[PDB]
Amino acid sequence: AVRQRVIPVYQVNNLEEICQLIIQAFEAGVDFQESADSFLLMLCLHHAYQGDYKLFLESGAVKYLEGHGFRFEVKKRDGVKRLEELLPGKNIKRTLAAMPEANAGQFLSFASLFLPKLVVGEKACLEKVQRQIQVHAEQGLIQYPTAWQSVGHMMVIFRLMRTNFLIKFLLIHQGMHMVAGHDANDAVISNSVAQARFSGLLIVKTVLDHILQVRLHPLARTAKVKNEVNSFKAALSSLAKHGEYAPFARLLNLSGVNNLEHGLFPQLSAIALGVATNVGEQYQQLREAATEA
Protein backbone atom coordinates (compact mmCIF):
# COMPACT_ATOMS: atom_id res chain seq x y z
CA ALA A 1 0.00 0.00 0.00
CA VAL A 2 3.13 2.17 -0.20
CA ARG A 3 2.75 2.87 -3.93
CA GLN A 4 -0.04 5.31 -4.79
CA ARG A 5 -2.75 5.14 -7.43
CA VAL A 6 -2.05 8.22 -9.60
CA ILE A 7 -5.03 10.01 -11.15
CA PRO A 8 -4.54 12.75 -13.76
CA VAL A 9 -6.83 15.73 -13.25
CA TYR A 10 -7.29 17.32 -16.68
CA GLN A 11 -7.81 21.08 -16.50
CA VAL A 12 -9.73 22.41 -19.54
CA ASN A 13 -11.75 25.65 -20.14
CA ASN A 14 -14.07 23.34 -21.96
CA LEU A 15 -15.43 21.20 -19.13
CA GLU A 16 -19.16 21.07 -19.89
CA GLU A 17 -18.42 20.31 -23.55
CA ILE A 18 -15.87 17.64 -22.61
CA CYS A 19 -18.31 16.05 -20.10
CA GLN A 20 -20.85 15.60 -22.93
CA LEU A 21 -18.22 13.70 -24.93
CA ILE A 22 -17.41 11.57 -21.88
CA ILE A 23 -21.07 10.70 -21.31
CA GLN A 24 -21.49 9.82 -24.98
CA ALA A 25 -18.52 7.47 -24.82
CA PHE A 26 -19.63 5.66 -21.62
CA GLU A 27 -23.07 5.10 -23.15
CA ALA A 28 -21.42 3.45 -26.17
CA GLY A 29 -19.48 1.20 -23.76
CA VAL A 30 -16.08 2.61 -24.68
CA ASP A 31 -13.45 0.82 -22.61
CA PHE A 32 -11.27 3.62 -21.22
CA GLN A 33 -9.00 1.30 -19.21
CA GLU A 34 -6.54 3.34 -17.13
CA SER A 35 -8.16 6.63 -18.18
CA ALA A 36 -11.67 5.84 -16.90
CA ASP A 37 -10.90 7.32 -13.47
CA SER A 38 -9.75 10.62 -14.94
CA PHE A 39 -12.86 11.02 -17.09
CA LEU A 40 -15.29 10.00 -14.35
CA LEU A 41 -13.57 12.52 -12.07
CA MET A 42 -14.23 15.28 -14.60
CA LEU A 43 -17.98 14.50 -14.47
CA CYS A 44 -17.89 14.78 -10.69
CA LEU A 45 -15.84 17.96 -10.89
CA HIS A 46 -18.41 19.53 -13.19
CA HIS A 47 -21.49 18.40 -11.27
CA ALA A 48 -20.45 18.56 -7.61
CA TYR A 49 -17.85 21.37 -7.68
CA GLN A 50 -19.31 23.55 -10.46
CA GLY A 51 -16.13 23.04 -12.45
CA ASP A 52 -13.98 24.72 -9.80
CA TYR A 53 -10.70 22.81 -9.89
CA LYS A 54 -9.24 24.65 -6.89
CA LEU A 55 -12.17 23.79 -4.62
CA PHE A 56 -12.18 20.22 -5.86
CA LEU A 57 -8.50 19.75 -4.99
CA GLU A 58 -8.97 21.09 -1.47
CA SER A 59 -12.20 19.13 -0.95
CA GLY A 60 -12.84 16.55 1.75
CA ALA A 61 -13.22 13.91 -0.96
CA VAL A 62 -9.72 14.49 -2.27
CA LYS A 63 -8.24 14.87 1.24
CA TYR A 64 -9.57 11.46 2.18
CA LEU A 65 -8.32 9.82 -1.00
CA GLU A 66 -4.88 11.42 -0.65
CA GLY A 67 -4.68 9.91 2.83
CA HIS A 68 -5.74 6.48 1.63
CA GLY A 69 -3.62 5.52 -1.36
CA PHE A 70 -4.26 8.08 -4.13
CA ARG A 71 -2.30 10.95 -5.69
CA PHE A 72 -3.88 13.53 -7.99
CA GLU A 73 -1.88 15.24 -10.72
CA VAL A 74 -3.18 18.40 -12.37
CA LYS A 75 -2.40 18.64 -16.07
CA LYS A 76 -3.47 21.85 -17.79
CA ARG A 77 -4.67 21.07 -21.30
CA ASP A 78 -5.63 24.09 -23.43
CA GLY A 79 -7.61 23.75 -26.65
CA VAL A 80 -8.99 20.24 -26.26
CA LYS A 81 -11.98 19.53 -28.52
CA ARG A 82 -11.96 15.72 -28.61
CA LEU A 83 -11.48 13.04 -25.96
CA GLU A 84 -8.75 11.44 -28.04
CA GLU A 85 -6.67 14.50 -27.26
CA LEU A 86 -6.80 13.73 -23.51
CA LEU A 87 -5.71 10.08 -23.92
CA PRO A 88 -2.23 9.46 -22.41
CA GLY A 89 -4.00 2.32 -26.32
CA LYS A 90 -4.33 1.76 -30.08
CA ASN A 91 -8.00 0.73 -30.35
CA ILE A 92 -9.50 3.24 -27.91
CA LYS A 93 -8.31 6.12 -30.10
CA ARG A 94 -9.97 4.51 -33.14
CA THR A 95 -13.25 4.03 -31.27
CA LEU A 96 -13.31 7.61 -30.03
CA ALA A 97 -12.44 8.86 -33.52
CA ALA A 98 -15.58 7.19 -34.90
CA MET A 99 -17.75 9.09 -32.39
CA PRO A 100 -20.55 11.15 -34.02
CA GLU A 101 -29.54 14.12 -24.46
CA ALA A 102 -28.38 14.60 -20.86
CA ASN A 103 -25.84 16.19 -18.51
CA ALA A 104 -23.17 15.14 -15.98
CA GLY A 105 -25.54 15.49 -13.03
CA GLN A 106 -28.04 13.16 -14.72
CA PHE A 107 -25.32 10.67 -15.60
CA LEU A 108 -24.13 10.58 -11.98
CA SER A 109 -27.60 10.36 -10.38
CA PHE A 110 -28.55 7.54 -12.79
CA ALA A 111 -25.34 5.72 -11.88
CA SER A 112 -26.13 6.15 -8.15
CA LEU A 113 -29.31 4.08 -8.61
CA PHE A 114 -27.08 1.03 -8.99
CA LEU A 115 -25.47 1.38 -5.52
CA PRO A 116 -28.16 -0.19 -3.28
CA LYS A 117 -28.09 -3.64 -4.92
CA LEU A 118 -24.84 -3.59 -6.91
CA VAL A 119 -23.30 -6.43 -4.90
CA VAL A 120 -26.43 -8.61 -5.14
CA GLY A 121 -25.91 -9.25 -8.87
CA GLU A 122 -27.00 -7.88 -12.26
CA LYS A 123 -30.57 -9.22 -12.26
CA ALA A 124 -31.45 -7.93 -8.79
CA CYS A 125 -29.60 -4.66 -9.34
CA LEU A 126 -31.38 -3.92 -12.63
CA GLU A 127 -34.78 -4.68 -11.10
CA LYS A 128 -34.02 -2.25 -8.29
CA VAL A 129 -32.96 0.49 -10.73
CA GLN A 130 -36.13 0.06 -12.80
CA ARG A 131 -38.34 0.29 -9.71
CA GLN A 132 -36.46 3.31 -8.40
CA ILE A 133 -36.74 5.12 -11.73
CA GLN A 134 -40.52 4.77 -11.51
CA VAL A 135 -40.57 6.00 -7.93
CA HIS A 136 -38.58 9.14 -8.77
CA ALA A 137 -40.69 9.66 -11.91
CA GLU A 138 -43.90 9.46 -9.85
CA GLN A 139 -42.61 11.85 -7.21
CA GLY A 140 -41.72 14.22 -10.05
CA LEU A 141 -38.13 14.28 -8.86
CA ILE A 142 -36.28 13.28 -12.03
CA GLN A 143 -36.79 11.91 -15.53
CA TYR A 144 -34.08 10.10 -17.53
CA PRO A 145 -33.69 10.00 -21.36
CA THR A 146 -35.61 7.38 -23.34
CA ALA A 147 -32.32 5.73 -24.36
CA TRP A 148 -31.21 5.06 -20.77
CA GLN A 149 -34.18 3.00 -19.71
CA SER A 150 -33.40 0.02 -21.91
CA VAL A 151 -32.13 -3.13 -20.22
CA GLY A 152 -29.13 -2.82 -22.53
CA HIS A 153 -28.11 0.60 -21.29
CA MET A 154 -28.55 -0.43 -17.65
CA MET A 155 -26.24 -3.42 -18.19
CA VAL A 156 -23.59 -1.00 -19.48
CA ILE A 157 -23.82 1.27 -16.42
CA PHE A 158 -24.00 -1.74 -14.04
CA ARG A 159 -20.65 -2.96 -15.36
CA LEU A 160 -19.13 0.50 -15.12
CA MET A 161 -20.22 0.79 -11.47
CA ARG A 162 -19.22 -2.76 -10.61
CA THR A 163 -15.64 -2.26 -11.73
CA ASN A 164 -14.77 1.37 -10.94
CA PHE A 165 -13.82 2.28 -7.36
CA LEU A 166 -13.50 6.01 -7.84
CA ILE A 167 -17.00 6.68 -9.16
CA LYS A 168 -18.52 4.68 -6.33
CA PHE A 169 -16.43 6.52 -3.78
CA LEU A 170 -17.19 9.98 -5.15
CA LEU A 171 -20.92 9.27 -5.35
CA ILE A 172 -20.97 7.93 -1.79
CA HIS A 173 -19.02 10.91 -0.52
CA GLN A 174 -21.27 13.35 -2.42
CA GLY A 175 -24.30 11.62 -0.93
CA MET A 176 -23.02 12.45 2.55
CA HIS A 177 -21.70 15.97 1.86
CA MET A 178 -24.08 18.10 -0.19
CA VAL A 179 -23.96 21.89 -0.57
CA ALA A 180 -27.04 23.83 0.65
CA GLY A 181 -30.11 24.00 -1.59
CA HIS A 182 -29.06 20.91 -3.54
CA ASP A 183 -30.71 20.05 -6.89
CA ALA A 184 -32.74 17.05 -8.09
CA ASN A 185 -29.71 15.05 -9.13
CA ASP A 186 -28.16 15.51 -5.71
CA ALA A 187 -31.45 14.51 -4.06
CA VAL A 188 -31.38 11.28 -6.04
CA ILE A 189 -27.72 10.63 -5.21
CA SER A 190 -28.19 11.23 -1.49
CA ASN A 191 -31.25 8.95 -1.51
CA SER A 192 -29.35 6.20 -3.34
CA VAL A 193 -26.45 6.41 -0.93
CA ALA A 194 -28.78 6.22 2.09
CA GLN A 195 -30.38 3.10 0.60
CA ALA A 196 -26.93 1.56 0.05
CA ARG A 197 -25.87 1.68 3.71
CA PHE A 198 -24.70 -1.80 4.78
CA SER A 199 -25.34 -3.31 1.36
CA GLY A 200 -23.53 -6.64 1.39
CA LEU A 201 -23.11 -6.32 5.15
CA LEU A 202 -26.40 -7.81 6.34
CA ILE A 203 -24.78 -9.48 9.35
CA VAL A 204 -23.42 -6.16 10.61
CA LYS A 205 -26.74 -4.31 10.35
CA THR A 206 -28.79 -7.13 11.88
CA VAL A 207 -26.41 -7.94 14.75
CA LEU A 208 -26.18 -4.27 15.73
CA ASP A 209 -29.97 -3.81 15.47
CA HIS A 210 -31.32 -7.05 16.95
CA ILE A 211 -28.61 -8.68 19.04
CA LEU A 212 -27.39 -5.48 20.68
CA GLN A 213 -29.42 -4.44 23.73
CA VAL A 214 -26.21 -2.50 26.78
CA ARG A 215 -25.76 -6.28 26.68
CA LEU A 216 -25.93 -9.13 24.18
CA HIS A 217 -29.27 -10.83 23.53
CA PRO A 218 -29.39 -13.77 25.99
CA LEU A 219 -29.10 -16.29 23.13
CA ALA A 220 -25.79 -14.74 22.10
CA ARG A 221 -24.16 -15.45 25.48
CA THR A 222 -23.98 -19.25 25.28
CA ALA A 223 -20.48 -20.71 25.06
CA LYS A 224 -21.44 -22.42 21.80
CA VAL A 225 -21.69 -19.08 19.99
CA LYS A 226 -18.72 -17.49 21.77
CA ASN A 227 -16.44 -18.18 18.81
CA GLU A 228 -18.84 -16.25 16.57
CA VAL A 229 -19.20 -13.29 18.94
CA ASN A 230 -15.42 -12.98 19.23
CA SER A 231 -14.94 -13.28 15.47
CA PHE A 232 -17.63 -10.65 14.85
CA LYS A 233 -16.16 -8.23 17.41
CA ALA A 234 -12.71 -8.39 15.82
CA ALA A 235 -14.10 -7.93 12.32
CA LEU A 236 -16.20 -4.97 13.47
CA SER A 237 -13.17 -3.38 15.15
CA SER A 238 -11.38 -3.44 11.79
CA LEU A 239 -14.45 -2.12 9.94
CA ALA A 240 -14.72 0.87 12.31
CA LYS A 241 -11.35 2.06 10.95
CA HIS A 242 -13.12 3.10 7.75
CA GLY A 243 -15.11 5.74 9.63
CA GLU A 244 -18.02 7.22 7.71
CA TYR A 245 -17.31 4.81 4.84
CA ALA A 246 -17.70 1.67 6.98
CA PRO A 247 -21.35 1.05 5.94
CA PHE A 248 -20.13 1.01 2.33
CA ALA A 249 -17.11 -1.23 2.90
CA ARG A 250 -18.45 -4.10 0.83
CA LEU A 251 -19.42 -1.74 -2.00
CA LEU A 252 -15.97 -0.17 -2.00
CA ASN A 253 -14.00 -3.38 -1.34
CA LEU A 254 -12.38 -1.86 1.75
CA SER A 255 -9.83 -3.78 3.82
CA GLY A 256 -11.02 -6.49 6.21
CA VAL A 257 -14.51 -6.75 4.75
CA ASN A 258 -14.11 -10.40 3.67
CA ASN A 259 -14.12 -11.27 7.37
CA LEU A 260 -17.74 -10.10 7.59
CA GLU A 261 -19.13 -12.61 5.09
CA HIS A 262 -22.63 -13.70 6.11
CA GLY A 263 -21.79 -17.40 6.04
CA LEU A 264 -19.14 -16.91 8.72
CA PHE A 265 -21.85 -16.27 11.35
CA PRO A 266 -24.72 -18.79 11.10
CA GLN A 267 -25.57 -18.84 14.81
CA LEU A 268 -25.78 -15.05 15.12
CA SER A 269 -27.81 -14.86 11.93
CA ALA A 270 -30.29 -17.41 13.28
CA ILE A 271 -30.70 -15.46 16.52
CA ALA A 272 -31.16 -12.19 14.63
CA LEU A 273 -33.81 -13.81 12.44
CA GLY A 274 -35.72 -14.99 15.51
CA VAL A 275 -35.61 -11.50 16.99
CA ALA A 276 -36.57 -9.66 13.80
CA THR A 277 -39.71 -11.77 13.27
CA ASN A 278 -21.69 5.52 13.28
CA VAL A 279 -19.87 2.17 13.25
CA GLY A 280 -17.04 3.20 15.58
CA GLU A 281 -19.57 3.99 18.30
CA GLN A 282 -21.38 0.68 17.91
CA TYR A 283 -18.11 -1.25 18.05
CA GLN A 284 -17.51 0.32 21.45
CA GLN A 285 -21.04 -0.74 22.42
CA LEU A 286 -20.39 -4.29 21.21
CA ARG A 287 -17.05 -4.29 23.10
CA GLU A 288 -19.05 -3.42 26.20
CA ALA A 289 -21.75 -6.08 25.80
CA ALA A 290 -19.18 -8.76 24.94
CA THR A 291 -16.91 -8.07 27.93
CA GLU A 292 -19.95 -8.29 30.21
CA ALA A 293 -20.69 -11.81 28.95
Numbering used by the authors: 35 to 122, 127 to 138, 144 to 256, 262 to 325, 335 to 350
What does the paper say about this structure?
The best construct with the highest expression yield and biochemical features covers the region of residue 36–351 of EBOV NP (named NPcore hereafter). In the structure of EBOV NPcore, one molecule is observed in the crystallographic asymmetric unit. All residues of EBOV NPcore polypeptide were be built into the final model, except three short gaps (residues A123–S126, E139–T143, K257–R263), and one loop region covering A326–V334 cannot be traced due to the lack of interpretable electron density, indicating their intrinsic structural flexibility. EBOV NPcore is featured by two relatively separate portions, an N-lobe (V36–R240), and a C-lobe (F241–E351). Both two domains are predominantly composed of α-helices, in which the N-lobe consisted of thirteen α-helices and two β-strands and the C-lobe consisted of seven α-helices. The major positive-charged crevice is located in the interface of N-lobe and C-lobe, in which K160, K171, R174, and K248 contribute the most essential positive charge. An additional minor positive-charged region is adjacent to the major crevice and is consisted by R205, K211, and R298. In EBOV NPcore, the hydrophobic pocket is comprised by Helix-14, Helix-15, and Helix-19, a number of hydrophobic residues contributed for the formation of this pocket, including V247, V250, I254, L255, L264, A268, V273, V277, F280, L284, L287, and L316. However, this hydrophobic pocket in occupied by P protein in NiV NP, but is accommodated by Helix-20, which is consisted by residues from N325 to E351, in EBOV NPcore. In the structure of EBOV NPcore alone reported in this work, Helix-20 folds towards and interacts with the hydrophobic pocket on the interface of the C-lobe of EBOV NPcore to form a compact structure.
EBOV is a typical non-segmented negative-sense single-stranded RNA (−ssRNA) virus. Similar to other −ssRNA viruses, the RNA genome of EBOV cannot exist as a naked form, but must be encapsidated by NP and further form a ribonucleoprotein (RNP) complex together with RdRp. Previous studies have demonstrated that N-terminal truncation of EBOV NP resulted the loss-of-function in NP-NP interaction and the first 450 amino-acid of EBOV NP, forming the core domain, is sufficient for the formation of nucleocapsid-like structures and viral genome replication. In particular, this region was revealed to exert the both the function of RNA binding and further NP oligomerization to form high-order RNP.
